[PDB]
Write a protein that binds this ligand. Structure first.
Ligand SMILES: [Ca+2]
Length: 323
């Protein structure tokens, strides 16, 4: 937890914001990739993650938080000036705002709604499983994102379908296990929402130890997954070879790790499927990459040392890439 680069910025953030923040922090993409981005944190709380992003996006970027806990927002809302001077030398130069509303309908949040195609990166940590309608949440994320933008988030998933009994249990529900999707049900739902290519960034195990809770979910394996789901018009459901290479140019780290299949060393050409090329080309990432032209179609993409897993269901990717 807590990368070194963030550590200094957190030391700067108002102690009331940190003391009262509920939850784990939203993980963020590589810091350099955030410059100038518009970022939205679903379930922002006291604003810990909003304020951290504020600094990293710089003065041209902007950050929006949403949440419906009155108490937590009121804290967030009154340290705007604080952080605008601590990051940007004047108290009237804040690049952030907090909105009150259900994450399921961003359009009706207060002061203002989040308009269509206005956001580069949507972040959240552990909001979906406590959510009332997952599909409507995902559809709404897709609405607010611009082309090339991404949902970059962490949640709890399961390696199989939970029983109605487990879904009804209030302790399980509250731990965000009860509402966990089977990963394949997840992949289909999110695709029905418009996101056709889901990329695994990292995965951790989650254990249920308490013997009676465990009895509702006997052999179920839960995982904490961070996924990134780009909104890019040209993506297909399959990962197809059109003979391309991408080359990370430098500037935002020694190397760029797109997901658990694709790592790009500075100035070394790496062969890529066309989905991966389109993500690079239409996302903010284009700035730090060179992507070669589409040739003739060559079949499914195999020029990767884990290609069989690359095409396998999410379930197999996750379980293999923990162990
Ligand atoms: Ca949060």
């Amino acid at each position: 937890a807590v990368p070194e680069s963030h550590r200094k910025i957190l030391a700067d953030i108002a102690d009331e914001v940190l003391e009262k923040f509920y939850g784990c922090g939203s993980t963020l993409p590589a810091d350099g990739s955030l410059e100038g981005a518009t970022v939205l944190d679903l379930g922002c709380g006291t604003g810990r993650d909003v304020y951290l992003a504020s600094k990293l996006v710089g003065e041209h970027g902007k950050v929006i938080g949403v949440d419906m806990l009155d108490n937590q927002l009121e804290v967030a809302r009154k340290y705007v000036e604080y952080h605008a001077e601590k990051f940007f030398g004047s108290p009237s130069r804040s690049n952030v705002r907090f909105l009150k509303g259900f994450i399921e309908n961003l359009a009706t949040a207060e002061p203002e709604g989040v308009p269509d195609s206005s956001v580069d990166i949507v972040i959240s940590n552990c909001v979906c499983n406590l959510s009332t309608n997952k599909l409507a949440l995902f559809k709404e994320i897709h609405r607010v994102l611009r082309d090339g933008g991404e949902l970059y988030f962490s949640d709890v998933y399961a390696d199989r379908r939970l029983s109605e009994a487990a879904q009804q249990d209030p302790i399980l529900y509250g731990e965000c296990l009860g509402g966990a999707l089977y990963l394949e049900d997840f992949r289909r739902l999110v695709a029905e929402a418009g996101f056709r290519d889901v990329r695994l960034v990292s995965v951790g195990p989650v254990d249920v130890s308490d013997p009676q809770l465990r009895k509702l979910v006997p052999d179920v394996q839960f995982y904490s997954c961070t996924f990134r789901c780009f909104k890019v018009a040209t993506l297909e459901a399959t990962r197809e070879d059109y003979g391309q290479s991408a080359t990370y140019l430098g500037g935002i780290g020694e190397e760029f790790k797109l997901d658990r299949f694709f790592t790009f060393p500075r100035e070394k050409p790496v062969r890529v499927d066309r989905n991966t090329a389109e993500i690079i080309r239409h996302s903010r990432l284009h700035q730090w990459f060179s992507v070669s032209a589409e040739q003739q179609h060559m079949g499914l993409f195999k020029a990767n040392d884990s290609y069989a897993l690359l095409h396998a269901p999410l379930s197999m990717q996750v379980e293999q890439l923990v162990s």
